[PDB]
Amino acid sequence: SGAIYVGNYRVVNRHLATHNDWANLVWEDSSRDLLVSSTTAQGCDTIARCDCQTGVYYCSSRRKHYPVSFSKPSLIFVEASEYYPARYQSHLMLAVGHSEPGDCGGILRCQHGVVGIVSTGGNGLVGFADVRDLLWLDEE
Ligand SMILES: NC(=O)[C@H]1CCCN(C(=O)C2(c3ccoc3)CCC2)C1
Ligand SMILES: [Zn+2]
């Protein structure tokens, strides 16, 4: 579990969004596993605006932050799960690391701020849904 809190926005994994998130919806994209809902109070996370490919992520199943190298956001095939059929997930970045059911939502950060959140796992890999292209998160 986990979310990004920037301005009056809450960014979560679309497959983990609560009934309250859907009742206060701003934007969602199934192909990216992302959902953004509105908030009353202002958040303090800063979104990275960069092309960094090294950062640190939080892994809840190990209670540990890991430094990782990660690939550029791409269209990657993700196996069928209880949340989605087998499909290409877009804006996804992979790293060699630990990720198991329960780790989605963990923040990936670089020197510039928040890069994205854990969205995939298994096979000794971790996938992160990129949020650096969502420039609108910084305004309105
Ligand atoms: N974005 C998606 O389509 C994911 C939805 C949740 C499940 N997904 C995973 O990759 C798995 C996982 C491992 C660790 O966290 C999650 C489930 C076994 C691998 C796929
Ligand atoms: Zn960066």
Regarding whether 133 and 92 lie in a shared domain, the answer is: yes
Ligand nearest to the CA of 50: 2
Regarding whether 50 and 40 lie in a shared domain, the answer is: no
Name, in order, each residue with C-beta under 8 angstroms of 139's C-beta and a sequence gap of 6 or more.
Answer: 7
**Which resolution in angstroms does this entry have?**
1.8
DSSP conformational letter for 83: S
In the chain, % helix, strand, coil (3-state, to 5) comes to 10, 50, 40
CA 83 to ligand 1: nearest atom? 5
Backbone phi and psi for residue 31, each to the nearest 5 degrees, phi listed first? -60, -20
CA distance 78 to 126: 12
CA distance 15 to 35: 9
- Is position 50 annotated in a ligand binding site? yes
Residues of 15-52 as b/e, b for ≥16 C-beta within 10 angstroms? ebbeeebeeeebebeeebbbbbbebeeebebebbeeee
- Is position 44 annotated in a ligand binding site? no
CA of 61 to the centre of ligand 2 (A): 25
Regarding whether 131 and 70 lie in a shared domain, the answer is: yes
Q: Is the CB of residue 78 below 6 angstroms from any atom belonging to ligand 1?
A: yes
Regarding whether 25 and 59 lie in a shared domain, the answer is: no
- Is position 59 annotated in a ligand binding site? no
Structural domain range at position 80: 45-140
Q: Are 17 and 3 in contact (CB under 8 A)?
A: no
The encoded tokens of residue 44 equal: 């303090």
Q: Is the CB of residue 122 below 6 angstroms from any atom belonging to ligand 1?
A: yes
Among all residues, which ones are annotated catalytic? Answer: 15, 33, 104
Distances, alpha carbon 36 to alpha carbons 55, 103, 129, in Å: 23, 19, 13
Regarding whether 53 and 38 lie in a shared domain, the answer is: no
Q: Are 58 and 107 in contact (CB under 8 A)?
A: yes
The count of domains in the chain is 2
Regarding whether 66 and 14 lie in a shared domain, the answer is: no
Give 130's strand partners.
116
Regarding whether 17 and 7 lie in a shared domain, the answer is: yes
The approach used to solve this structure was X-ray
Regarding whether 89 and 67 lie in a shared domain, the answer is: yes
Residue with tokens 């490919």: 53
Regarding whether 93 and 72 lie in a shared domain, the answer is: yes
Smallest CA-to-CA distance from 129 within 98, 95, 100 is with: 95
Regarding whether 122 and 71 lie in a shared domain, the answer is: yes
